[PDB]
Amino acid sequence: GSLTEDGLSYKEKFVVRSYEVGSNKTATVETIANLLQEVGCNHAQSVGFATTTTMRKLHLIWVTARMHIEIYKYPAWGDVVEIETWCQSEGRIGTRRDWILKDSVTGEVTGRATSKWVMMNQDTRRLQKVSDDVRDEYLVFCPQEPRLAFPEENNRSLKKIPKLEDPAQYSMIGLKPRRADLDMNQHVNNVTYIGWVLESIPQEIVDTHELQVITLDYRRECQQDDVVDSLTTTTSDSQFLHLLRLSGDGQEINRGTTLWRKK
Amino acid sequence: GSLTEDGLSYKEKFVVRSYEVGSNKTATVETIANLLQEVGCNHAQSVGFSATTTTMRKLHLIWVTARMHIEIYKYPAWGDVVEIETWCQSEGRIGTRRDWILKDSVTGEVTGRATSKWVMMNQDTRRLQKVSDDVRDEYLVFCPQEPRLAFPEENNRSLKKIPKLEDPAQYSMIGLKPRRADLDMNQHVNNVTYIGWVLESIPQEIVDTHELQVITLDYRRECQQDDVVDSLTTTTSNDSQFLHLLRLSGDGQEINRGTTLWRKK
Ligand SMILES: O=C(O)COc1ccc(F)cc1
Ligand SMILES: O=C(O)COc1ccc(F)cc1
């Protein structure tokens, strides 16, 4: 793709592939999650990167604290979907990355996503409050005035997610990441947690409904040799409360909510 | 992409994506396997298919992969453009064969090649049958009439007999289950998943010091969504060779068998 005229956002067109679609002949939420990740890497690369030299000398990385995705229409196999992405500062809390999905032919907004990222030491794993020198190097690539994919007053991207109480209504136990679930740094990518969360949704709901919204809170990183339990309870359109936790000790790694519409 | 000038093969260029590369910053064998599958689907679509013919749909017949063989010389890096050319051929009444050539779009050098053998089967009864004369004429108008082989060699490793891994296996990955992302548009476990499952029993040490040069996979039975697989490996060998076996966790029913060849980095 390419940066837009002002250089304050990035655009890319993707053609949906045969292996990227589900039983309805449209792209899966995991293909969409992969495309958002891909368009965000190319934006970081096109502006010289998403770690800066200040963060490299300090062993600092950006970790996803929260992801929220709303899809109105899923692209079909062979369709061209255009994605626009941009970053923003959230004071000393961290950074935010937003996405808008469109039909390349009609120009209609077919989806949108927002994610909150926090600073962390690659080694000690502790969340740092973002300094001042780090703002003076990534604000020259962010829009100065606020630009939100979910601007709405009191929207569902900033909702407090409760913890799923036992017993869960539904569950998928013994989930292990394989080598294909790890990225170039050998860490389990954030798209795998989405797939793991959806594994505990009954095949009946999947066959009769379409996923409209998903909000995912990341608490702990899952390692390659870890085993995950996926838990779901209907809270309702169909709404679900979700929880990913380690098979052994029951250590919480993720919590979220999904919203499904009838087909 | 597009069909070549003669309409007897299809070409497509792919840019390698960030989530498609491994720890070495180059495409995984599963990304390559996905790209071959994708370029084969667009070739079938470009010549009027949906890869079943009108006689095949009339009789509930499908093409199933009996064998896959892939040899990679150089793996494309993240951001590289890899061009893939594919074509089909009739193998008498046995079935069909699909071949692939992988190239660097910039230098034009062959960086890999693959071959697969497909057999005819009833979708419902799962009974493999010989290709009839009517089906053969419907797909011979889209195939090169003279032989065109990605592995023409008189002693190639794509027609090798694979033995069955004897117990105890040297290495193993137990309790592998396919998720919804492992199933295709027809709800069947995608062929690429078996490749990932076969490689799960290779020690992380071999993966970190070697690169996969060759893989040959024999498909015996289809794995269902609610099935559980056991992946088994034994070293048979600068080059490291392995014998592989996928089997059902329960009864020990064979679903796959294969061999891999790895070279030092
Ligand atoms: O690796 C760990 O243990 C910490 O993971 C986190 C992930 C996301 C967070 F917002 C905070 C922490
Ligand atoms: O579903 C079954 O039991 C049969 O699966 C096969 C798969 C690949 C083959 F080459 C032959 C058979």
Three-state SS for chain B is CEECCCCCCEEEEEECCHHHECCCCEECHHHHHHHHHHHHHHHHHHCCCCCCCHHHHHCCEEEEEEEEEEEECCCCECCCEEEEEEEEEECCCCCEEEEEEEEECCCCCEEEEEEEEEEEEECCCCCEECCCHHHHHHHHCCCCCCCCCCCCCCCCHHHCCCCCCCCCCCEEEEEECCCHHHECCCCCECHHHHHHHHHCCCCHHHHHHEEEEEEEEEECCCCCCCCCEEEEEEECCCEEEEEEEEEECCCCCEEEEEEEEEEEC
Measure the CA–CA gap between B262 and A5, rounded to whole angstroms.
47
Residue with tokens 């409904």: A209
Q: Distance, CA A118 to ligand 1 centroid (Å)?
A: 9
Biggest distance spanned by C-alpha atoms of chain B: 53
Counted across chains A and B, CB pairs separated by less than 8 A come out at 73
In chain A, what is the straight-line distance between the N-terminal and C-terminal CA atoms, in Å? 33
Give the C-alpha separation, A72 to A232, whole Å: 23
Contact call for residues A18 and B33 (beta carbons, < 8 A): no
Judged by a CB distance cut-off of 8 A, whether residue B13 touches chain A is: no
Which residues of chain B are within 8 Å of residue A223 when distances are taken between CB atoms?
none
d(CA B155, CA A234): 60
- CATH of region A170-262: 3.10.129.10
Q: Which of B258, B242, B162 is nearest to B202 (CA)?
A: B242
Contacts of A151 (CB under 8 A, 6+ apart): none
Judged on CB neighbours under 10 Å (0-12, 13-18, 19+), A105 is: exposed
Q: Do B37 and A18 touch (CB under 8 A)?
A: yes
User: B259: closest CA among B247, B240, B152?
Assistant: B240
Give the number of the atom of ligand 1 that is nearest the alpha carbon of residue A221: 1
Distance, CA of B264 to chain centre: 23
Catalytic residue among B88, B223, B244, B256: B223
Contact A183 B19 (CB under 8 A): yes
Cα–Cα distance between B13 and B82 in angstroms, integer?
Answer: 6
Resolution (A): 2.3
Best CA proximity match to B234, nearest among B136, B139, B164, B152 = B164
Report CB contact under 8 Å: A199, B179. Answer: yes
In 3D, which of B58, B30, B60, B63 has the Cα closest to residue B44?
B63
| Tokens standing for residue A68 | 């929220």
Integer CA distances (angstroms), B255 to B98, B151, B174, B247, B252, in order: 22, 26, 14, 5, 9
Report chain B's C-alpha Rg in angstroms.
Answer: 18
- Is the distance from the beta carbon of residue A220 to the nearest atom of ligand 1 less than 6 Å? yes
Instruction: Judge whether B49 is closer than 8 Å to chain A, CB to CB.
Output: no
8-state DSSP, A134: T
Q: Which two tokens stand for residue A172?
A: 């998928």
d(CA B167, CA B169): 5
Q: CA-nearest residue of chain B to A227?
A: B175
Q: Is the CB of A65 under 6 A from ligand 1?
A: yes
Nearest CA owner, ligand 1 atom 4: A220
Asked if B177 and A180 come within 8 Å (Cβ–Cβ), the reply is no
Tell how far the Cα of B121 is from the centroid of ligand 2, in angstroms. Answer: 8
Nearest chain A CA: its distance from B154 CA (Å): 34
* Alpha carbons within 13 A on the beta-carbon side of A11: 12
Task: Describe chain A by its helix, strand, coil percentages, rounded to 5.
Answer: 20, 40, 40
C-beta of residue A10 within 8 angstroms of C-beta of residue A2: yes
| Ligand 1 binding pocket includes A125 (Cβ within 6 Å) | yes
CATH class of the domain at B2-158: alpha beta
Tokens matching residue A234: 């209907």
Strands B2-3 vs B61-72: parallel, antiparallel or unpaired:
unpaired
Quick one: DSSP state of residue A188? Answer: B
Question: What is the distance between the alpha carbons of residues B51 and B48, in angstroms, rounded to a whole number?
Answer: 9
**Whether A18 and B187 lie within 8 Å, measured CB to CB:** no
Contact A180 B18 (CB under 8 A): no
Between the alpha carbon of residue A229 and those of residues A147, A199, A204, A243, B260, the distances in Å are 37, 10, 20, 8, 33
Residue whose tokens read 């991207």:
A157
Q: Three-class SS of residue A126?
A: coil
Count other C-beta atoms under 10 Å from residue A222's C-beta: 24
CATH number 3.60.21.10 is the correct assignment for the domain at B171-264: no
Return the best residue to mutate from A95, A220, A249 for the ligand 1 pocket (most ligand atoms within 8 A of CB). Answer: A220
Q: At A256, list the tokens.
A: 């979220």
The DSSP symbol for A4 reads: -
CA distances from A216 to A163, A195, A196, A244 (A): 12, 12, 12, 10
- Rounded to an integer, what distance in angstroms lies between the CA atom of residue A47 and that of residue A116? 20
Q: What is the SS3 assignment for A208?
A: helix
Instruction: Specify the residue with its C-alpha closest to ligand 1, atom 1.
Output: A221
Contact list in B for residue A37 (CB cut-off 8 A) is 18-19
Residue of A nearest to B50 (CA): A18
Query: Is A110 within 8 Å of A72 (Cβ atoms)?
Result: yes
Alpha-carbon distance of A49 to A39, in angstroms, equals 14
Residues of chain B with Cβ-Cβ distance to A18 below 8 Å are 37-38, 41-42, 185
Q: Tell me, yes or no, if B24 is annotated catalytic.
A: no
Radius of gyration of chain A (CA): 18
Q: CB–CB of B200 and A206 under 8 A?
A: no
Residue B42 tokens read as 């667009």
Chain A CB contacts of B181 below 8 Å: 28, 30, 195
Contact between B35 and A20 (Cβ < 8 Å): no
* Cα distance between residue A131 and residue B40, in whole Å: 51
Ligand 2: which of B68, B126, B254, B257 to mutate, most ligand atoms within 8 Å of CB? B126
* Residue indicated by tokens 């069955």: B164
Q: Which residues, at least 6 apart from A134, have a Cβ–Cβ distance to it below 8 Å?
A: A52, A54, A55, A119
**Domain boundaries along the sequence of chain A:** 2-157, 170-262
Q: Look at residues A185, A196, A200, A208 and name the one whose alpha carbon lies nearest to residue A240.
A: A200
Neighbours of B168 (CB within 10 A): 8
Centre of ligand 1 to C-alpha A218, Å, is 7
The arrangement of secondary structure in A2-157, i.e. its CATH architecture, is Roll (3.10)
Find tokens 């998720």 and name the residue: B179
| B127 CA distance to ligand 2 middle (Å) | 8
Angle among Cα A198, A202, A207 to the nearest 5 degrees reads 95
Three-state secondary structure call for residue A196: helix
Interface contact A23-B181, CB threshold 8 A: no
Pocket-testing residue among B67, B120, B121, B253, ligand 2, by greatest number of atoms within 8 A of Cβ: B121
Minimal Cβ distance to A180: which of B23, B30, B177: B30
